[PDB]
């Protein structure tokens, strides 16, 4: 009893396949008009590079298009991240507003982006047949500012997952082991990104979703203030939840890519089309200031033990930034179990899971999401006595699960009102010290296909930003050596629940990919965000 | 009902101590300074008066202690000041010399924390529990030169339009004394129309900074909910987001609101409050004078208008149009909605439970009507009542409807349609490519104690706090003894309770100020400011 869904699979399926065969038939007539094209100093060249000469006129937008479409089909047969190829695009492409500050440049779009005749499935069935009947005002801007967005990125089924599969489009796969995650629910992004076949790409993060597939493919994303950016468009599972706040982002190969992108988004278009939005231009004073950093920075939030290969990334950077000339300070902002037991899962799950629960009435649950839906489906007195019963043995457990219950309004407002206090209070903190910037471990490196749905409490590192709404970004520094993987296999965890011995696994078999580290600044603080970013890849990564 | 009796006497004698302290002191000044023209000195505009402060020309004491005797003596006939912020003549001689505001005397709505102070809101239960620091707005005042002294009072828990509580008493419109202030920054408005502050800051969330600036003959600003800090404001009910609180200033004229805000937005408040984004005063904006397309409306289809209010709103569309601008035909849809399911739902989600608290022991002023013995009300008989309600008085079952207690799930729901409607209306406003939304404002002043049994009279105000756009609200004409005597024809559009208390409450109003409103996209502040000016030299140059 489960043929509506079924039937959705198919067309998906059906629809994806076509997809790539109209990129494939696009890519391969392109070569045989261009069989001296030098693909492979245009695929590599950096995109500040690639920009200026689509500027200049060295290159041609259908050069570095149709180059990057085939590399992108190329790249997929390996790590299925294409849902769909975005079939307009070729107009948009001659039609491309050449003062545009991304003229020429393919950008790559996750799927809950809206786009005029396409799906935002986001996996689930009933959202199936039923294309958007036109552009979010992202793409508006991204099209205005001369960017060519050309493919639908997969995401895990509702995007409530930090890995990527669904019923209808399947599962995507780490481009640098396809035995692992390439994170999510950003994943699709990461995964081509990461392979070379996107320059640049579109995200959303509302508990790490941007953060966590950048870390795990090896690329580099940005989560900006949740409101510095216009939503307007974009597909979700619940509407009207404002506790936490969806914060959409680019993902990129470098720092300076990120930069870009945001300038071209913080412009007069998007200010226009989304009053709503604050018409805070790009600062790049800001984003250029090159002076000494008060960075606060930690090696564990005291929640999810870090692994071997995190703390290494963690202190190196540390020792590096003060090699350079920066102070670093120790800092931990306070009661951190509080912010993501009570505050992120109270906002993200107010109402028991019920609006959200709705998403999946009739559809397949896809083994990437473990037990959530399992969970959320029960009752308010029975996960209230779980908890209770749950809460010697294993507190952490028992905390989110007895927070994860459905409320009245009026204990809403309380919760909302104490979220505004916990931010205060960590701003307090941070003023306290008088840091400019936060330095943080990152999660890494990929946890295995269809394990993050079961590692919840790692969520820890990323979700604390979107509980405080700060701006967080992730650059890569290092990869998992055979020390830091053999180091792995003493893991303990600190609450030593199934959580901790999961992702003790899941991290196994990990030599070679690449870890993170975490860039945090205040509310509104991008630029520097995204200063201190540029200076940790121009220490770590130097090339 | 002991404990409420004994925070009226203390606070009694706190508000007289105030004003004693407040006497010596001025009358300590005027001694050592008796050939100073404090006529001279009190009708300078705030412009004039900061660049003489500037020069030198002027002492920061002589234009403090000269405000500071005016507040006394307005204070006599108004009953506005509920306490003398005593610390400020410390302040005073510290006050940095670049600051914007560099010796300007600012009043306080009593919610906005001062260090020692109460902010008693009226409520017994916050009397006796003095602030332990300034909030930041009051901060950035002070990081900017300015000189805070005096809290001025509000209508019992800030939730009425009207301005009394058993605390402080009843403060009074200076214009006529059977005649309400407004509010709730009821306060501010008598203090600043009868000359006792150049310049002053209160708060809005259905109308509060509008209300009483309409009803005392001055300007006011509500902006964008986040465009100033809400750190540290003193309220009833907290993490209520659905319609955002917006604070900002008030004073005489637009300018004294446009300096005022360039003051605020600048590094100190975006240092001392990061939430708030950092968007600077855009001077180019403000002192512009391109053409613009004004919508304009003359009547919400919902509140009446009173006469006085109609011709206020034409002759200015008319000046409007004189003057090159474009007068374009424009209504947001679905205001009837946005009252009654929107705005009621989002203030009253959890049935005014949260709100209730606060007067658990206390009397209940009675400006506040029966908002207290309607909301004590068990849901089911409120949906019973409202029942009995809904075919002759469709408005009443609406609103009574929508004040019942909700789940989160629910919440998610309005508010997920609260940021839809918000949408439709800027979709609108596009299509007809507006600049610029011309309105009416309520007014004239009702008659004391008769706000609170006028909900219906909230509409205009509400309207852009539900949509969260800026709306300010500028004087442009006096009632006239034609405008009064047509009240008589006055009927209201639903002919409920009502219609029937603000009929009432709107007569004897001849000489009375009527004002105009406002409006312009969120984080528009300074072309709202700009059509405000603009408004102003047309119709009260
Ligand atoms: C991206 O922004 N995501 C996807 C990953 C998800 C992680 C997460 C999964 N399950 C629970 C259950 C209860 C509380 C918090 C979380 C977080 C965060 C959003
Ligand atoms: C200032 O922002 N205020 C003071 C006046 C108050 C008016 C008001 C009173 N009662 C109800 C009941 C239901 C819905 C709306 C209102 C508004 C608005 C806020
Ligand atoms: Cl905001």
């Known amino acids: 009893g489960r043929q509506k869904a079924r039937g959705a699979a198919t067309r998906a399926r059906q629809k994806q396949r076509a997809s790539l065969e109209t990129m494939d038939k696009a890519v ?49 047969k390996g ?5 769909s190829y975005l079939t307009d695009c070729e107009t948009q492409l001659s039609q491309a507003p050449r003062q545009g500050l991304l003229y020429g440049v393919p950008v790559s779009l996750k799927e809950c982006f809206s786009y005029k005749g396409h799906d935002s499935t986001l996996g689930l069935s009933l959202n199936e047949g039923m294309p958007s009947e036109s552009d979010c005002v992202v793409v508006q801007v991204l099209k205005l500012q001369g960017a060519v967005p050309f493919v639908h990125t997969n995401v895990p089924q509702s995007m409530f997952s930090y890995d990527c599969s669904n019923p209808l489009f399947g599962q995507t796969m780490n481009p640098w082991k396809s035995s692992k995650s390439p994170g999510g629910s950003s994943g699709g992004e990461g995964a081509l990104i990461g392979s070379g076949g996107s320059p640049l790409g579109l995200g959303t993060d509302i508990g790490g979703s941007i953060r966590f597939p950048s870390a795990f493919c090896g690329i580099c994303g940005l989560k900006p203030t949740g409101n510095r950016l216009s ?45 709503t939005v604050p018409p805070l231009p790009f600062r790049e004073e800001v984003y250029r200031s090159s002076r ?11 929640y999810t033990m870090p692994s071997p290969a995190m703390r290494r990334a963690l202190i190196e950077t540390k020792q590096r930034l003060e090699a350079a000339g920066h102070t670093l300070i120790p800092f931990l902002p306070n009661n951190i179990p509080y912010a993501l037991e009570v505050l992120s899962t109270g906002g993200l799950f107010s109402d028991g899971g019920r609006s959200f629960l709705q998403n999946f009435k009739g559809d397949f649950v896809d083994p990437c999401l473990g037990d959530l839906i399992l969970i959320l489906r029960l009752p308010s007195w029975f996960k209230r006595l779980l908890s209770l019963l749950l809460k010697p043995l294993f507190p952490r457990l028992a905390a989110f699960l007895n927070n994860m219950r459905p409320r009245s309004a009026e204990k809403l407002w309380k919760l909302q009102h104490e979220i505004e206090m916990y931010r205060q209070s960590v701003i307090a903190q941070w003023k306290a010290m008088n840091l400019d910037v936060l330095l943080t471990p990152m999660l890494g490196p990929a946890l295995d296909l269809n394990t993050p749905g079961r590692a919840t409490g790692a969520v820890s590192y990323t979700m604390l930003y979107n509980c405080l709404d700060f701006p967080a970004g992730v650059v890569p520094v290092t990869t998992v050596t055979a020390e830091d993987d053999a180091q792995m296999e003493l893991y303990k965890g600190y609450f030593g629940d199934i959580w901790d011995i999961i992702l003790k696994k899941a991290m196994k078999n990990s030599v070679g990919l690449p870890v993170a580290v975490q860039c945090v600044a205040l509310p509104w603080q991008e630029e520097l965000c995204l200063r201190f970013m540029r200076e940790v890849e121009q220490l770590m990564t130097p090339q």
Do not use: I
């Open 231 to 275: 939503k307007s468009g974009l597909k979700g599972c619940v509407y009207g939840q404002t506790a936490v706040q969806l914060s959409l982002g680019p993902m990129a190969r470098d720092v300076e890519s990120l930069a870009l992108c945001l300038k071209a988004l913080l412009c007069e278009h998007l200010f226009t089309l989304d009053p």
């Open 28 to 76: 391969q007539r392109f070569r045989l008009q261009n069989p001296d094209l030098d693909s492979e100093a245009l695929l590599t060249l950096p995109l500040l590079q690639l920009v200026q000469k689509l500027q200049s006129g060295e290159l041609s937008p259908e050069a570095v298009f149709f180059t990057y479409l085939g590399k992108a089909w190329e790249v997929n």
């Open 79 to 83: 790590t299925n991240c294409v849902t």
């Open 292 to 302: 000494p950093l008060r960075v606060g920075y930690y090696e564990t939030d005291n």
